[PDB]
Amino acid sequence: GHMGNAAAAKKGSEQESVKEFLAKAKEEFLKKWESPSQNTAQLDHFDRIKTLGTGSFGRVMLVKHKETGNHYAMKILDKQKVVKLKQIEHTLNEKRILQAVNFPFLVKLEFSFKDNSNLYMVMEYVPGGEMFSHLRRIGRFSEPHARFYAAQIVLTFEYLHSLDLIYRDLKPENLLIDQQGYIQVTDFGFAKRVKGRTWTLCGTPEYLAPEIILSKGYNKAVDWWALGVLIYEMAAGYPPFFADQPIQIYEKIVSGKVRFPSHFSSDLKDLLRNLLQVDLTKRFGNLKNGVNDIKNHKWFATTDWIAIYQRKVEAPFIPKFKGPGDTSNFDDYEEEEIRVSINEKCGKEFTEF
């Protein structure tokens, strides 16, 4: 066979140890998921410094906690925009999931609160900036550097999916680089606990699996499709289904035809054809062998999965660090007021937040 006796035994033991880890991780998650802990704060506990990014509903801002002096990233959501875009349950999903998870590549939530106008989620500040910026600046990553990042996403999805969580918004914009050059996934705006199928049309056009676009009840395999899009974009510099308007993007995704740059290795193309697979009975991450089809693929042969988890692998890139509140790795955005109305808005809709 492909593996000699020793290698086969080692791999088998490693895969069993993953099962043991995940069983314990699930116990820990459910304890927090069922009886969540208080993490309250209020707006005047923080100094607002700079807008780090924008989204729907508001911004992410660098803030400074007045008492401790610690810097944080504060996601602000205007409640009236959330209710109109029927993003109420998604925002509740986001908070509850962030509160309960624990993994080295998932950003850590510190506080959550609300006022008359807004919802607030305060998390660890990740100063190295978005993968997106670094990727656009350099053009494309080498296959070894793309692989280093990809491995972290594979482990992160192995963790999330074991908890019945689907992530649903993988893209370089949502992957921050920390001081050691490792990834922090942020933004859990579309994450959801799903036992089998779910039906909401959501995500980012370039990263949507065909079954989302086709309004089919879909499952966690949409995240493995999105991993294929991410790996392609990291290694090429542009995504596999690339067009000016969402409707044209969707047409390309549903056709399913992928073309690869001539510099892609054969190993990489094979992995990507198996991730960017329209047929769910054939898509890696959705078969009997589960995540092992991905982790044991030739393109990952040089990946030491435990060393990645332990963060003992030398990162390809270490971000410029200029102090705990330095924002040099982020682009500039228009600074808008944080309005807090005298009157409570949408109190009914956000009681459980």
């Binding site: 893209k171 049309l201 056009p205 370039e206 676009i213 000016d244």
Partner: peptide, 15 residues
């Protein structure tokens, strides 16, 4: 010739 979105991409909440 290829053409597509190079800037940050916003999520969609419906299609």
């Amino acid at each position: 010739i290829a053409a597509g979105r190079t800037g940050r991409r916003q999520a969609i909440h419906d299609i």
